[PDB]
Design a protein around this ligand. Structure first.
Ligand SMILES: Nc1ncnc2c1ncn2[C@@H]1O[C@H](COP(=O)(O)OP(=O)(O)OC[C@H]2O[C@@H](O)[C@H](O)[C@@H]2O)[C@@H](O)[C@H]1O
Ligand SMILES: Nc1ncnc2c1ncn2[C@@H]1O[C@H](COP(=O)(O)OP(=O)(O)OC[C@H]2O[C@@H](O)[C@H](O)[C@@H]2O)[C@@H](O)[C@H]1O
Lengths: 231, 50, 148
């Protein structure tokens, strides 16, 4: 709200998992610093603004931000993919990710994390293409029954880590939270299936009760005829 | 692009979910028939023993 | 209600199971303290605010809070999952959780608890994906009978 003082040194308090890269234009030296330290700009040091991706449908230019978190966070993206039976369905992935830094004092590897400008959009599309390419080759029944092996061992199929060597970003196991179909017709035929499943469940219960009642009636009738022959 | 092509693929969903629930219903009916035949065979064996 | 004094040292009374991590920006030293102790900020020490998850349907940004409880608590989340018979059903888990600290004086392991910013959202989604992946492979009768 209050206007900042242009004279004072621009200081940005970096969180413990975030990372900011500053470009010292006066000496052409690029340094990236992370930790609890607040970075102080020089006479010409400038922040690396990252036009990231945010929101549910993952708009490509939102959440612009000076920092870059390297901690184990997660972004949830809805992706609308089509199965092999032409039944398109929108589904969500948790996308557990963290930046793997091998050495934290290396001018090249620590500055490699700022290579791709939109790491959240790139890591969403690179994992959306894999999911769409792996689910469209398998039918609806095999996807509705086994929805986790063909989205995790397929998204990062043989290893549990989806490494991205452009920026060092790894992606851990993806946790699906909806596989809800887009069409209301497909959401109604699956409903009709509930009844056919609960209908055959109560029909099996009724048939088992009828068979047990018939067996008990036959046993009681056999005991009655044996007792009548003895009488 | 075409809504006709996006409707014939939809019709395919149902033919896929329809044959899926038909296979489920047929498997349930075959298991019910097998259990009914087993219970009937046990009932006739017990009736012969009675 | 009353406005605080900006001069006085910002002190936060940490409960016995909660944990707060303070970033001493003047010396770039990060320390996390827990117990009955009230932590006092220095000239540039700042709290680690955790934009957690709260509510029943587990909204991802609510309950922002300086502390991080490590005690055996539990968060209840409704998750709407689908069975193998296409009969979707919403169900609740208690999620009994506690942070296991092997050593309480280690600069790295005690600061590892503040790695994920939303531990309640991450621990809900990581346990919601497993539940949805394990229940969708089994039918309604086997899930309604053996639900545990
Ligand atoms: N300024 C930033 N710098 C670097 N990374 C960021 C920044 N802002 C967001 N990110 C990362 O990009 C992701 C984008 O998330 P959103 O789509 O905005 O939120 P959503 O995907 O709905 O849920 C993410 C959830 O994870 C938690 O980290 C966070 O508390 C949030 O609830 C974030 O989770 C975060 O890890
Ligand atoms: N400021 C905080 N810092 C750290 N952890 C927190 C904080 N606030 C909540 N948590 C943890 O996140 C969980 C979120 O819970 P909610 O969804 O808000 O409440 P609910 O899930 O309905 O029930 C939790 C129940 O457990 C008990 O600990 C608590 O008394 C509550 O009744 C809490 O249970 C708590 O363990």
């Amino acid at each position: 709200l209050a206007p900042r003082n242009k004279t004072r040194v621009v200081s940005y308090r970096v969180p413990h998992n975030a990372a900011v890269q500053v470009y010292d234009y006066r000496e052409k030296r690029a340094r990236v610093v992370f930790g609890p330290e607040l970075v102080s700009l020089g006479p010409e040091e400038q922040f690396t603004v990252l036009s990231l991706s945010a929101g549910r449908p993952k708009r490509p230019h939102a959440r612009r931000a000076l920092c870059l978190l390297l901690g184990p966070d997660f972004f949830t993206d809805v992706i609308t993919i089509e199965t092999a039976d032409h039944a398109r369905l929108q589904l969500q992935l948790a996308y557990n990710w963290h930046f793997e830094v091998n050495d934290r004092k290396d001018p090249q590897e620590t500055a490699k994390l700022f290579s791709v400008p939109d790491f959240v959009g790139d890591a969403c599309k690179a994992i959306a293409s894999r999911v769409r390419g792996a689910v469209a080759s398998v039918t609806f029944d095999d996807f509705h029954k086994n929805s986790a092996r063909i989205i995790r061992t397929a998204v990062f199929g043989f290893r549990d880590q989806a490494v991205f060597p452009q920026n060092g970003l790894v992606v851990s196991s993806v946790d699906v939270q909806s596989v809800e179909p887009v069409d209301q017709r497909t959401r109604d035929a699956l409903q009709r299936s509930v009844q056919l499943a609960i209908e055959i469940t109560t029909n099996s219960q009724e048939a088992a009760a009828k068979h047990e009642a018939q067996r008990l009636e036959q046993e009681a009738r056999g005991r009655l005829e044996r007792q009548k022959i003895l009488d």
